[PDB]
Tab-separated table of N, CA and C in Angstrom:
chain	number	residue	atom	x	y	z
A	1	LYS	N	1.180	-1.302	0.222
A	1	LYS	CA	-0.043	-0.360	0.025
A	1	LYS	C	0.742	1.487	0.195
A	2	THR	N	0.309	2.142	-0.792
A	2	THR	CA	1.324	3.566	-1.288
A	2	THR	C	0.975	4.559	0.644
A	3	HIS	N	-0.014	4.010	1.229
A	3	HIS	CA	-0.330	4.729	2.560
A	3	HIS	C	-0.826	4.126	3.687
A	4	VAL	N	-0.228	4.279	4.793
A	4	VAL	CA	-0.620	3.165	6.020
A	4	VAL	C	-1.179	4.160	6.933
A	5	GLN	N	-2.163	3.647	7.482
A	5	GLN	CA	-2.835	4.474	8.605
A	5	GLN	C	-1.778	3.860	9.907
A	6	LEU	N	-1.152	4.754	10.503
A	6	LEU	CA	-0.717	4.847	12.166
A	6	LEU	C	-0.953	5.452	13.119
A	7	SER	N	-0.705	4.929	14.520
A	7	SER	CA	-1.366	5.917	15.414
A	7	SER	C	-0.207	6.564	15.859
A	8	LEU	N	0.714	7.674	15.869
A	8	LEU	CA	1.937	7.637	16.648
A	8	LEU	C	1.732	8.198	18.210
A	9	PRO	N	2.378	7.907	18.882
A	9	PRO	CA	2.416	8.576	20.425
A	9	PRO	C	3.107	9.788	20.526
A	10	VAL	N	2.489	10.506	21.199
A	10	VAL	CA	2.787	11.629	21.533
A	10	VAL	C	4.010	12.004	22.494
A	11	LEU	N	5.206	12.409	22.371
A	11	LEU	CA	5.765	12.126	23.265
A	11	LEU	C	6.336	13.585	24.010
A	12	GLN	N	6.691	13.968	25.255
A	12	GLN	CA	7.142	15.038	25.910
A	12	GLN	C	8.643	15.279	25.864
A	13	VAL	N	9.287	16.327	25.174
A	13	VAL	CA	10.841	16.540	24.559
A	13	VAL	C	11.382	15.898	25.841
A	14	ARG	N	10.963	16.517	27.039
A	14	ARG	CA	12.151	15.952	28.095
A	14	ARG	C	11.965	14.687	28.593
A	15	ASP	N	11.039	13.932	28.326
A	15	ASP	CA	11.113	12.155	28.490
A	15	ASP	C	11.670	11.429	27.616
A	16	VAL	N	12.202	11.976	26.478
A	16	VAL	CA	12.682	11.377	25.217
A	16	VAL	C	14.121	10.944	25.568
A	17	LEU	N	13.842	9.465	25.264
A	17	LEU	CA	15.623	8.935	25.699
A	17	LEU	C	16.482	8.728	24.755
A	18	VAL	N	16.051	8.712	23.023
A	18	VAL	CA	17.193	8.728	22.156
A	18	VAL	C	16.269	10.050	21.229
A	19	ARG	N	16.852	10.830	20.890
A	19	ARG	CA	16.627	11.756	20.460
A	19	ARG	C	16.682	12.369	19.337
A	20	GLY	N	17.291	11.145	18.246
A	20	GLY	CA	17.673	11.152	16.794
A	20	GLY	C	17.597	9.797	16.551
A	21	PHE	N	17.409	10.148	14.800
A	21	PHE	CA	17.400	8.740	14.036
A	21	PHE	C	19.143	8.374	13.617
A	22	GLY	N	19.854	9.240	13.795
A	22	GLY	CA	21.236	9.189	13.442
A	22	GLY	C	21.881	10.579	12.698
A	23	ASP	N	22.947	10.243	11.514
A	23	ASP	CA	23.725	11.040	11.233
A	23	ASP	C	23.779	11.416	10.214
A	24	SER	N	23.109	11.541	9.221
A	24	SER	CA	22.813	11.972	8.104
A	24	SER	C	21.513	12.128	7.608
A	25	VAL	N	21.281	13.096	6.715
A	25	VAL	CA	20.001	13.050	6.224
A	25	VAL	C	19.077	11.481	5.507
A	26	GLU	N	19.731	10.864	5.183
A	26	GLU	CA	19.545	9.857	4.017
A	26	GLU	C	19.299	8.483	5.364
A	27	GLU	N	20.032	8.616	6.571
A	27	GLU	CA	20.357	7.387	7.880
A	27	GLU	C	18.695	7.769	8.403
A	28	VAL	N	18.612	9.275	9.071
A	28	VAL	CA	17.159	9.655	9.632
A	28	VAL	C	16.102	9.334	9.136
A	29	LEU	N	15.953	9.352	7.781
A	29	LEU	CA	14.522	9.175	6.960
A	29	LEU	C	14.611	7.792	6.693
A	30	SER	N	15.525	7.064	6.461
A	30	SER	CA	15.937	5.395	6.740
A	30	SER	C	15.190	4.725	7.594
A	31	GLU	N	15.945	5.555	8.577
A	31	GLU	CA	15.736	4.803	10.331
A	31	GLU	C	14.089	5.525	10.685
A	32	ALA	N	13.915	6.402	10.431
A	32	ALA	CA	12.520	6.511	10.290
A	32	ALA	C	11.210	5.845	9.905
A	33	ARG	N	11.580	5.831	8.864
A	33	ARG	CA	10.567	5.100	8.104
A	33	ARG	C	10.507	3.528	8.278
A	34	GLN	N	11.799	2.889	8.903
A	34	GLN	CA	11.590	1.867	9.969
A	34	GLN	C	10.608	1.483	11.055
A	35	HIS	N	11.282	2.913	11.601
A	35	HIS	CA	10.275	2.787	13.135
A	35	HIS	C	9.117	3.071	12.934
A	36	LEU	N	8.138	3.627	11.729
A	36	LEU	CA	7.346	3.948	11.843
A	36	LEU	C	6.901	2.388	11.255
A	37	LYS	N	7.002	1.792	10.222
A	37	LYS	CA	7.030	-0.075	9.643
A	37	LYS	C	6.501	-0.586	10.961
A	38	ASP	N	7.385	-0.516	12.116
A	38	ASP	CA	7.504	-1.464	13.184
A	38	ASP	C	6.937	-0.791	14.205
A	39	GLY	N	6.365	0.188	14.358
A	39	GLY	CA	5.539	0.706	15.464
A	39	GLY	C	6.379	1.104	16.472
A	40	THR	N	7.620	1.473	16.064
A	40	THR	CA	8.315	2.303	17.444
A	40	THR	C	9.017	3.417	17.138
A	41	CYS	N	8.110	4.014	16.512
A	41	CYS	CA	8.287	5.504	16.162
A	41	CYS	C	7.191	6.576	17.114
A	42	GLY	N	7.854	7.738	18.057
A	42	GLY	CA	7.328	8.598	18.540
A	42	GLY	C	6.751	10.075	17.870
A	43	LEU	N	6.323	11.098	18.229
A	43	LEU	CA	6.308	12.554	17.897
A	43	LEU	C	6.477	13.249	18.637
A	44	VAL	N	7.210	14.168	18.395
A	44	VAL	CA	7.308	15.288	19.658
A	44	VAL	C	6.522	16.507	18.877
A	45	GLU	N	5.435	17.495	19.702
A	45	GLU	CA	4.963	18.187	19.239
A	45	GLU	C	6.051	19.464	19.004
A	46	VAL	N	6.225	20.546	18.257
A	46	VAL	CA	7.376	21.421	18.003
A	46	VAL	C	6.900	22.510	18.486
A	47	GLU	N	7.167	22.989	19.430
A	47	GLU	CA	7.118	24.619	20.044
A	47	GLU	C	8.715	25.322	20.264
A	48	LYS	N	8.620	26.385	20.703
A	48	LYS	CA	9.438	27.057	21.013
A	48	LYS	C	10.497	26.430	21.926
A	49	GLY	N	11.894	26.040	22.011
A	49	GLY	CA	12.727	24.861	22.788
A	49	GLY	C	12.706	23.711	22.539
A	50	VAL	N	11.939	23.591	22.400
A	50	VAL	CA	11.937	21.774	21.654
A	50	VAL	C	13.116	21.476	20.706
A	51	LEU	N	13.405	21.988	19.484
A	51	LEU	CA	14.239	21.582	18.635
A	51	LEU	C	15.581	21.424	18.746
A	52	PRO	N	15.755	22.603	19.527
A	52	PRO	CA	17.434	22.529	20.269
A	52	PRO	C	17.683	21.422	21.171
A	53	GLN	N	16.229	20.755	21.721
A	53	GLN	CA	16.661	19.861	22.706
A	53	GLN	C	16.918	18.181	22.249
A	54	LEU	N	16.406	18.126	20.930
A	54	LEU	CA	16.701	17.030	19.998
A	54	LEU	C	18.001	17.039	19.097
A	55	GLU	N	18.283	15.959	18.451
A	55	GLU	CA	19.952	15.771	17.866
A	55	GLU	C	19.404	15.926	16.212
A	56	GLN	N	20.296	16.726	15.663
A	56	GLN	CA	20.185	16.916	13.845
A	56	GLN	C	20.685	15.444	13.187
A	57	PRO	N	20.796	15.317	12.306
A	57	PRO	CA	19.234	15.405	11.421
A	57	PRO	C	17.934	15.431	12.303
A	58	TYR	N	16.885	16.462	11.964
A	58	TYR	CA	15.618	16.291	12.250
A	58	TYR	C	14.791	15.434	11.023
A	59	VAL	N	13.809	14.733	11.425
A	59	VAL	CA	12.864	14.334	10.833
A	59	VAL	C	11.423	14.627	10.792
A	60	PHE	N	10.740	15.333	10.055
A	60	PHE	CA	9.348	16.146	10.291
A	60	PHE	C	8.285	14.934	9.764
A	61	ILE	N	7.108	14.920	10.511
A	61	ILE	CA	5.971	14.658	9.947
A	61	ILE	C	5.265	16.538	9.374
A	62	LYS	N	4.539	16.391	7.916
A	62	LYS	CA	4.379	17.619	7.160
A	62	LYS	C	2.968	16.957	6.408
A	63	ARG	N	1.738	17.651	6.759
A	63	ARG	CA	0.577	17.655	6.469
A	63	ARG	C	0.758	17.401	4.518
A	64	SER	N	0.384	16.751	3.826
A	64	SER	CA	0.759	16.706	2.703
A	64	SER	C	-0.635	16.787	1.703
A	65	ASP	N	-1.958	16.667	2.635
A	65	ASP	CA	-3.291	17.411	1.774
A	65	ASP	C	-4.337	17.662	2.919
A	66	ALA	N	-5.217	18.605	2.561
A	66	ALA	CA	-6.301	19.063	3.445
A	66	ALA	C	-7.837	17.819	2.918
A	67	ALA	N	-8.704	13.977	5.154
A	67	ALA	CA	-8.195	13.589	6.344
A	67	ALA	C	-9.088	12.120	6.624
A	68	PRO	N	-8.507	10.679	5.659
A	68	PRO	CA	-9.230	10.212	5.668
A	68	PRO	C	-9.765	9.173	7.030
A	69	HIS	N	-10.766	8.885	7.862
A	69	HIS	CA	-11.161	7.922	8.650
A	69	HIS	C	-10.335	8.752	10.084
A	70	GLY	N	-9.891	9.917	9.817
A	70	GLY	CA	-9.550	10.688	11.203
A	70	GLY	C	-7.741	10.742	10.632
A	71	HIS	N	-7.220	9.951	9.683
A	71	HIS	CA	-6.025	10.030	9.536
A	71	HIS	C	-5.451	11.232	8.297
A	72	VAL	N	-4.927	12.332	9.475
A	72	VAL	CA	-4.041	13.227	8.171
A	72	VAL	C	-2.834	12.760	7.780
A	73	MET	N	-3.162	12.965	5.889
A	73	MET	CA	-1.939	12.472	5.422
A	73	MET	C	-0.854	13.391	5.554
A	74	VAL	N	0.443	12.919	5.622
A	74	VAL	CA	1.532	13.479	5.954
A	74	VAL	C	3.006	12.539	4.925
A	75	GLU	N	3.558	13.240	5.235
A	75	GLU	CA	4.823	12.668	4.325
A	75	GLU	C	6.150	13.371	5.172
A	76	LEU	N	7.557	12.489	5.267
A	76	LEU	CA	8.272	12.476	5.359
A	76	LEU	C	9.198	13.706	5.215
A	77	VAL	N	9.497	14.573	6.198
A	77	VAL	CA	11.218	16.065	5.419
A	77	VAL	C	11.615	15.866	6.578
A	78	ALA	N	13.248	16.086	5.886
A	78	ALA	CA	14.449	15.931	6.921
A	78	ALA	C	14.899	17.280	6.901
A	79	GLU	N	16.135	17.672	7.755
A	79	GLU	CA	16.305	19.198	8.090
A	79	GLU	C	18.160	19.184	8.721
A	80	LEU	N	18.954	19.435	8.061
A	80	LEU	CA	20.441	19.491	8.934
A	80	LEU	C	20.656	20.875	8.398
A	81	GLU	N	21.037	21.810	9.630
A	81	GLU	CA	21.808	22.740	9.241
A	81	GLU	C	20.864	23.840	8.378
A	82	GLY	N	19.737	23.687	8.561
A	82	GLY	CA	18.848	24.638	8.384
A	82	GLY	C	18.284	24.638	6.778
A	83	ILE	N	19.087	23.527	6.129
A	83	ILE	CA	18.348	23.031	4.603
A	83	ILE	C	17.311	21.656	5.129
A	84	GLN	N	16.036	21.470	4.456
A	84	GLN	CA	15.547	20.286	4.099
A	84	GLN	C	15.715	19.643	3.000
A	85	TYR	N	15.118	18.923	3.350
A	85	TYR	CA	15.374	17.622	2.175
A	85	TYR	C	13.563	17.232	1.682
A	86	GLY	N	13.291	17.570	1.218
A	86	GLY	CA	11.578	17.704	1.033
A	86	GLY	C	10.608	18.842	0.875
A	87	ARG	N	9.719	18.861	0.553
A	87	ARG	CA	9.040	19.922	0.156
A	87	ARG	C	7.597	19.463	0.864
A	88	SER	N	6.598	19.866	1.637
A	88	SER	CA	5.805	19.551	2.146
A	88	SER	C	4.378	20.386	2.921
A	89	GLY	N	3.561	20.258	3.679
A	89	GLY	CA	3.128	21.295	4.277
A	89	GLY	C	3.324	21.206	5.617
A	90	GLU	N	2.331	21.937	6.455
A	90	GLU	CA	2.454	22.188	7.669
A	90	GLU	C	3.099	21.316	8.772
A	91	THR	N	4.256	21.388	9.859
A	91	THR	CA	4.629	20.473	10.315
A	91	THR	C	3.759	19.969	11.611
A	92	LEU	N	3.330	18.329	11.982
A	92	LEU	CA	2.620	18.065	12.726
A	92	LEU	C	3.898	17.939	13.921
A	93	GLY	N	5.066	17.568	13.917
A	93	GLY	CA	5.676	17.229	14.740
A	93	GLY	C	7.227	16.540	14.132
A	94	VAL	N	8.008	16.450	15.345
A	94	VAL	CA	9.289	15.552	15.097
A	94	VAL	C	9.398	14.423	15.082
A	95	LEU	N	9.679	13.442	14.416
A	95	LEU	CA	9.403	11.993	15.147
A	95	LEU	C	11.106	11.737	15.602
A	96	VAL	N	10.822	10.881	16.335
A	96	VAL	CA	11.768	9.990	17.252
A	96	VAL	C	11.658	8.913	17.686
A	97	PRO	N	12.763	7.796	17.332
A	97	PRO	CA	12.502	6.686	18.433
A	97	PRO	C	11.756	6.457	19.190
A	98	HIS	N	10.516	5.593	19.573
A	98	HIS	CA	10.078	5.173	20.862
A	98	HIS	C	10.576	3.972	21.431
A	99	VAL	N	11.031	4.335	22.913
A	99	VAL	CA	11.625	3.270	23.636
A	99	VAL	C	10.680	2.898	24.736
A	100	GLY	N	9.591	3.342	24.909
A	100	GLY	CA	8.684	2.912	25.903
A	100	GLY	C	8.512	4.253	26.748
A	101	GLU	N	8.504	5.486	26.795
A	101	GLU	CA	8.129	6.098	26.943
A	101	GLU	C	6.778	6.586	27.210
A	102	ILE	N	6.154	7.024	28.236
A	102	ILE	CA	4.346	7.071	28.034
A	102	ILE	C	4.106	8.476	27.624
A	103	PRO	N	3.073	8.060	26.844
A	103	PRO	CA	2.818	9.580	25.365
A	103	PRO	C	1.709	10.136	26.380
A	104	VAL	N	1.239	11.185	25.600
A	104	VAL	CA	0.513	12.641	26.723
A	104	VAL	C	-0.470	12.585	25.555
A	105	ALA	N	-0.513	11.688	24.614
A	105	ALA	CA	-1.571	11.889	23.684
A	105	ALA	C	-1.210	10.635	22.085
A	106	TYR	N	-2.211	10.916	21.271
A	106	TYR	CA	-1.797	9.642	19.491
A	106	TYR	C	-2.051	10.728	18.686
A	107	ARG	N	-1.212	11.054	17.666
A	107	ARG	CA	-1.659	11.517	16.284
A	107	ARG	C	-2.198	10.359	15.651
A	108	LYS	N	-3.040	10.219	14.834
A	108	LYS	CA	-3.628	9.666	13.654
A	108	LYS	C	-3.233	9.963	12.459
A	109	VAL	N	-2.325	9.158	11.663
A	109	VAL	CA	-1.954	9.927	10.343
A	109	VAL	C	-1.961	8.870	9.143
A	110	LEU	N	-1.718	9.377	7.972
A	110	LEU	CA	-1.861	8.044	6.908
A	110	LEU	C	-0.658	8.484	6.336
A	111	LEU	N	0.251	7.531	6.512
A	111	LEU	CA	1.863	7.857	5.911
A	111	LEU	C	1.640	7.686	4.605
A	112	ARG	N	2.050	8.114	3.581
A	112	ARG	CA	2.747	7.946	2.392
A	112	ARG	C	4.015	7.333	2.528
A	113	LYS	N	4.116	6.330	1.924
A	113	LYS	CA	5.474	4.977	2.239
A	113	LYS	C	5.652	4.721	0.751
């Protein structure tokens, strides 16, 4: 399937134990996609002070369309030293590995895979 319905656990930035997916734009997009497939991917909602507490490169989910079955359509865009790889809509948050942190909410998304 080109799209997969996911429910992503929303994590508080200060709870996150593994603060990025790796060391290159290509690696973080790779790892993010693997974790999304394996149900081991969390979402941190971006506000003032959040991104400097996480590791670059960043992986965002961005709204790709204006929402089947409550699931917002999203795609992956990476960022490293102020350059983004991809072009999409508004940021829903930054993806991180999920290793058992307690979420505050779930974000229903339809991921372009």
